[PDB]
From TrEMBL, chain B:
Pyruvate binds at V84, K163. Keywords: Metal-binding. This is Uncharacterized protein. Mn(2+) binds at E122, E124, D153.
């Protein structure tokens, strides 16, 4: 199942080229600030999936073409990112850096400095958990998303800029991915293919990243783990379009705009 | 004014040795998960300050000894910490602490079991942000500051993971609103382990001053109400062991004591 926020924090299920509105069904308030609707849906999902599946045929269906998809989790407890982590410790990204699949990456105006793209699989945590054993990893994974880990090349602050952590376009629930350790990932800048890899090539694997993170910190429903980027990290400029596709997880494209 | 969470996310005003429950008048829901009640109170405070002042005479007052004070903001958008940042004579820029590290004034610091390694205390003034804001000019700093709390920036000495363990960011015991601190750049701060005074300083000795730390953080990131800025620690950083008690006092801001306990 593919869960998405759209048009001001409405919750939907993505079915083909359409999205069905589950806002009223789930009792989510899109005017809630801070918006924690998707984190509550994630915590309660094993109790609501059946209801969503049983009621879908009655729900309002809008074409994807007619809505503004947003970042699925806008105020996570934390964003944990693994540096490197592909065959040829973790750091934190601020929630404030999150942006959705229709928001531009805004470059800070740093002449003598480049902004690089990083294509990553995101893990969305589904359970409050500490010291998760490797063998138990699937119990605490809600699903997966595409993530761009944008960085000013040279310091925590150079990964911290607003728009430097695009996540989207939806969460694919964990049950809809056969084996997250065999996913093809690809990133284009315009028509140029810059990054291509398989999550089989992860150095510290998904169970290891969850076990490592949970040994230090209580994880929460909504937490994002950025699993790393392969080779082909390179620059973006005003007018570029970054495309990321992860097999079975999803696909998104964002514009790059120079900041004023 | 001193704003507190207690007894599972109830909101209170601290009056001398008592607290008054303001949960109903603020429309807070203590059962809400995630608990964002103090963030909403902070965003709306200039509209609700009058309402709280007017009600105080009518509200029942519980002795502080009879409640459990909690961390005032349990799920901030971010925690921004400035490394070092005191003159000894009275780094990679700011870093981020996970919200998961937050602890209250009645919670113990739990030492991870690291033979060969020590856990150190760091006494710091915390700034609580009051406004959604980006690229704040030094001269407008006062517009975006809600208030102040005491913060312990605990670390395994040697790496981000080293500042990230659960209970390695005690904050409390309440927020003191910015109008109740005449000048936050003149505050005396002390930290004790048991009867031993380890850290003594004044915020007049900050290398990057309060306005600088807000302009710096806000140039990179959109700040949110409830955001915590850890302003740095002076000299006297040192170890804590099972059975230690850490007391932090900051003049005009607050004081808290926590127990230290060896983890499983
Ligand atoms: Mn990365
Ligand atoms: Mn510190």
């Amino acid at each position: 199942m593919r869960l998405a926020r759209f048009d001001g924090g409405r919750l939907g299920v993505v079915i083909g080229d359409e999205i069905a509105d589950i806002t009223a069904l789930t009792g989510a308030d899109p005017a809630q600030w801070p918006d924690m609707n998707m984190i509550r849906l994630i915590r309660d999902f094993e109790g609501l999936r059946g209801a969503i599946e049983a009621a879908l045929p009655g729900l309002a269906r809008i074409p994807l073409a007619q809505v503004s998809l947003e970042t699925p989790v806008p105020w996570p407890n934390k964003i944990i990112a693994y540096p490197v982590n592909y065959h040829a410790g973790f750091f934190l990204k601020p929630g404030s850096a999150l942006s959705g699949p229709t928001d531009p990456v805004v470059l800070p105006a740093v002449p003598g400095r480049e902004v690089h793209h990083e294509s990553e699989l995101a893990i969305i945590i589904g359970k409050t958990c500490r010291s998760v054993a490797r063998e138990d990893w699937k119990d605490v994974v809600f699903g997966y998303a595409c993530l761009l880990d944008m960085v000013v090349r040279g310091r925590v602050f150079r990964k911290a800029y607003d728009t430097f952590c695009p996540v989207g376009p939806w969460i694919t629930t964990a049950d809809a991915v056969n084996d997250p350790a065999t996913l093809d990932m690809k990133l284009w800048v315009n028509d140029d293919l810059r990054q291509k890899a398989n999550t089989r090539d992860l150095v510290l694997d998904i169970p290891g990243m969850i076990a490592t993170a949970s040994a230090v910190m209580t994880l929460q429903p909504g937490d994002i783990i950025a699993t790393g980027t392969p080779e082909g990290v390179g620059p973006v400029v005003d007018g570029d379009r970054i495309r990321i596709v992860i097999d079975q997880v999803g696909e998104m494209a964002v514009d790059v705009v120079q900041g004023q």
